[PDB]
Write a protein that binds this ligand. Structure first.
Ligand SMILES: [Mg+2]
Ligand SMILES: [Mg+2]
Ligand SMILES: [Mg+2]
Ligand SMILES: [Mg+2]
Ligand SMILES: [Mg+2]
Ligand SMILES: [Mg+2]
Ligand SMILES: [Mg+2]
Ligand SMILES: [Mg+2]
Ligand SMILES: [Mg+2]
Ligand SMILES: [Mg+2]
Ligand SMILES: [Mg+2]
Ligand SMILES: [Mg+2]
Ligand SMILES: [Mg+2]
Ligand SMILES: [Mg+2]
Ligand SMILES: [Mg+2]
Ligand SMILES: [Mg+2]
Ligand SMILES: [Mg+2]
Ligand SMILES: [Mg+2]
Ligand SMILES: [Mg+2]
Ligand SMILES: [Mg+2]
Ligand SMILES: [Mg+2]
Ligand SMILES: [Mg+2]
Lengths: 251, 229, 116
RNA sequence: UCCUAAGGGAAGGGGUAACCCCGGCAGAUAGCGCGAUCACGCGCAUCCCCGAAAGGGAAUCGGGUUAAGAUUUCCCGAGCC
RNA sequence: ACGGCCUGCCAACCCUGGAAACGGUUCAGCCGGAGGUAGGGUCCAGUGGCCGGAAGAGCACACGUCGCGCGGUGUCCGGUGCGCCCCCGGCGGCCCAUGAAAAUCCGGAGGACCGAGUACCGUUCACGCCCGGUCGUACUCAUAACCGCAUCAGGUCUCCAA
RNA sequence: ACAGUCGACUC
RNA sequence: CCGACUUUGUGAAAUGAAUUUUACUUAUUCCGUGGGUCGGAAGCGGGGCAUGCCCCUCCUUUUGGCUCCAAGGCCCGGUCUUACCGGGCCGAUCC
């Protein structure tokens, strides 16, 4: 056979990300003495649309701690933030939407976004539009906290991981039908070359395990094992179950 | 006078820009500096076996000034201090037809030479530098001098031994014979050296150095064990 | 130290003074005036330029620029160029149109060498 | 011609039997820049080169002139950088 | 072209003043006690008007003379637009799409440091002085100058458009 | 709510 | 995918005559910085109903302004020697 489409993506060539018009990475500011032991005051200057991303971005301008210059950071905007708002970052910051506090400063039940995982990774969790995490518990004899992620999983993270209060703005985006091949086309033009998709059953045997046959059908179980070689692992990888979700397994 | 006034700066965690204090602790150095500093630190942490921790116990400053006073007396003949006498003995040979210069007495150096003098028992005091690298050149000298029953000392600084003999580094010295004017001063020096070094040898061979953890680790160690108490 | 960043300390660089010259033989000026000005052009088009536009046309070296052409026309022919225009001809040689400053007369310069 | 785009090449370093393959991996990174000279000082942050005769961009117009050059390259006049 | 003077579009902006019986306004919108209507100003664009360039040029006539001769007459007046080409202004709509960078140039914050008035410290003004290097530049651009073995009914990116 | 002049276009 | 050995050191317990468990940091692996405040002790305020000896603080919450190259004090040392430069600490806690 020949190298199948799933295998061709790892080489990069035409499958790299489409990032000419993007506005830079979105993250917190490098954690320093100011944010560990108090609070640093920032002003939101613009709310901007970032191509390839549903969450809007907030340009926050801080004043440098020890140099005579500005420091211009870029956050994933929480719903509610507006231009001219003073956001506050640090350990002693108030519990307000748009503020960045460590999780030891957040009561259980709080809603949080852009949560760090390692102290200083500048944000890994709950970053898509309308997504948040919830603080479940604190364990003060470890310096760790349990949060619920958007997927529902419960992760133990340090008590110094920083998070932004509230939820990421732009929520509700995926509830709108697209109605058109054209609308899907413009969505992916600014993300990556993954659209449209030809069904493997419509291919020839030389380029896909599902290809070929006098009728379009798979002919073998579509669930493939976890340890299958690349070029063989197509379909439902390491699936624990198939079929329509009902009852407990839908929970 | 009434114009001169004071504008104290609120050098807080959100206030005025701080001044130029010393951040010598946090400077990110070149690799050559970086690796050498970690080299001493890693040495600290690991358990040094006795043969290598038999160093780390050097001769005192008080005794070294005493010993190095003697060695400075017996410096070998300088490069310049060596060509006029060969010039002078030309006439003694060319006319007098005799060489008459008598045995000049000085320290002996060079590792192979000193090892030779030790095993023939012509050595009376061995002086081993603590900082020879690679260390294997001298690790076994304490055992050989102890077995052959010659007093030996471990002074601090191979660069200093080399200075005596007019080299850059020397790594070992030994005095074979002193003049009849210094028997007393020589004897008193080597009495302590045998006591300091050749007496503890059979209990320092079973002493393991190293294992010292870091400052912040020890400050954490004490807190943990105090709560036990 | 106040800065956290270690830069490269700056030291002395000594200049070159070699113990023997790598080149003894001097440089001849291979683009002298005769190399620069090869020969005047006598095409009927050029002969027009002498009267109508107070101009002289030469075939010059391919490696001579407008500045050296101005110099060489003063050493040779002892005249002044108001303006020099050049083109590399389709067959590979460079041609220079020399305009004389209005003191000198191009026709009289043409006669003193022989073109007209 | 200058600048950068997508992108290419690339020094230390990593791999490689070698040809070659890797640029963010962070190394006293190449270049130091600026004020000075009558010497010293300051600062060094995401950093070299290439890459567009349709992108960005110091400055020109009218009138004449040839067998063949110029609408703005030559001549006349008038400007500009 | 360029140099001045005028004009000042549609927007934007300023000052006075205080709006219901609401008014101002577009083809559409929209605007107003966070200050409308009004009255009066500022600025902006211009490929707009006048003068200089510049009539000495060009063109059209009519003459008269040997050889890039010479002389003469003139180079006006209004009006029109769901017109066409280019460009611009200012609104509106669309997006799970929001539609380069750098070189380069301009402006500001701060104010360490600086000088005379027998005179020295200046100065992004006007005028005046010098210099401006290298390579391309002809011609075709196609039912014959390019590719298709050809002077091949094929193919090959543009600008002008009665 | 008149008088004068002008006016290219549509039904 | 899985095991042994190697990298690979340190020391503690329970069953055993090896197996799971644990603890250290310097190997290694990962992360973040223009390696820009880490550890310990102080100090400052605060809570006292054993004056405990301990705990909680660290000179910015405010409206889309601004924020550098230190004022000020003390002390050496030059000089005009009868008017002017160099330096040291504090300000900016110590180790
Ligand atoms: Mg595609
Ligand atoms: Mg699909
Ligand atoms: Mg499909
Ligand atoms: Mg098919
Ligand atoms: Mg197959
Ligand atoms: Mg099939
Ligand atoms: Mg079929
Ligand atoms: Mg079947
Ligand atoms: Mg040319
Ligand atoms: Mg270039
Ligand atoms: Mg260009
Ligand atoms: Mg261009
Ligand atoms: Mg001209
Ligand atoms: Mg008005
Ligand atoms: Mg105009
Ligand atoms: Mg005019
Ligand atoms: Mg058009
Ligand atoms: Mg618009
Ligand atoms: Mg041409
Ligand atoms: Mg042409
Ligand atoms: Mg044509
Ligand atoms: Mg061919």
């Amino acid at each position: 056979g020949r190298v199948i489409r799933a295998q061709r993506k790892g080489a990069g060539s035409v499958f790299k990300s489409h990032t000419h018009h993007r506005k830079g990475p979105a993250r917190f500011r490098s954690l320093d003495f100011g944010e560990r032991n108090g609070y640093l005051k920032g002003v939101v200057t613009d709310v901007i649309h970032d191509p390839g991303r549903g969450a809007p971005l907030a340009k926050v301008t801080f004043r440098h701690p020890f140099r005579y210059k500005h420091q211009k950071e870029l956050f994933v905007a929480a719903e509610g933030m507006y231009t001219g708002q003073f956001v506050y970052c640090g350990r002693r910051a108030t519990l307000s939407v748009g503020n960045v506090l460590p999780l030891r400063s957040v009561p259980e039940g709080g809603v949080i976004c852009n949560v760090e995982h390692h102290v200083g990774d500048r944000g890994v969790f709950a970053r898509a539009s309308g997504d948040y995490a919830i603080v479940i518990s604190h364990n003060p004899d470890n310096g760790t906290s349990r949060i619920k992620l958007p997927s529902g999983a419960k992760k133990i993270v340090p008590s110094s991981c920083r998070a932004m209060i509230g939820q990421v703005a732009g929520g509700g985006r995926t509830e709108k039908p697209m109605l058109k091949a054209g609308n899907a086309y413009h969505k992916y033009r600014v993300k990556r070359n993954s659209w449209p998709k030809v069904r493997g059953v419509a291919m020839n045997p030389v380029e896909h395990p599902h290809g070929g046959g006098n009728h379009q059908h798979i002919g073998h179980a579509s669930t493939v094992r976890r340890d299958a070689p690349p070029g063989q692992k197509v379909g439902l990888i390491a699936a624990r179950r198939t079929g329509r979700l009902r009852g407990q397994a839908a929970a | 006078n009434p114009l001169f006034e004071k504008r104290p700066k609120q050098f807080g965690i959100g206030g005025a820009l701080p001044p130029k204090k010393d951040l010598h602790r946090f400077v990110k150095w070149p690799k050559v500096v970086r690796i050498q500093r970690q080299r001493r630190i890693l040495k600290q942490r690991l358990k040094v076996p006795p043969a290598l921790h038999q160093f780390t116990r050097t001769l005192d400053k008080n005794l070294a000034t005493n010993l190095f006073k003697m060695l400075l007396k017996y410096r070998p003949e300088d490069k310049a201090a060596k060509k006029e006498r060969l010039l002078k003995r030309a006439q003694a040979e060319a006319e007098g037809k005799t060489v008459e210069a008598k045995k000049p007495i000085v320290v002996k150096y060079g590792l192979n030479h000193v090892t030779y003098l030790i095993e023939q028992s012509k050595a009376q005091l061995v002086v081993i530098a603590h900082d020879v690298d690679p260390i294997e050149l001298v690790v076994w000298l304490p055992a050989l001098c102890r077995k052959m029953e010659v007093p030996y000392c471990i002074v601090k600084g191979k660069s200093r031994l080399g200075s005596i003999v007019h080299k850059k580094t020397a790594s070992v010295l030994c005095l074979t014979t002193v003049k009849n004017e210094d028997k007393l001063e020589f004897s008193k020096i080597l009495e302590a050296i045998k006591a300091n070094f050749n007496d503890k040898f059979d209990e320092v061979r079973k002493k393991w150095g190293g294992g010292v953890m870091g400052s912040k680790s020890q400050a954490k160690t004490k807190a943990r064990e105090r709560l036990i108490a | 130290r106040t800065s956290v960043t270690f830069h490269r300390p700056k030291t002395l660089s000594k200049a070159r003074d070699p113990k023997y010259p790598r080149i003894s033989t001097p440089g001849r000026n291979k683009l002298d005036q005769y190399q620069i000005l090869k020969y005047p052009l006598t095409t009927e088009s050029a002969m027009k330029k002498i009267e109508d536009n107070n101009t002289l046309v030469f075939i010059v070296d391919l490696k001579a620029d407008k500045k050296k052409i101005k110099a060489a026309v003063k050493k040779m022919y002892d005249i002044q160029a108001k303006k020099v225009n050049t083109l590399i001809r389709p067959d590979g040689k460079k041609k220079a149109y020399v305009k004389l400053t209005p003191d000198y007369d191009a026709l009289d310069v043409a006669n003193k060498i022989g073109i007209i």
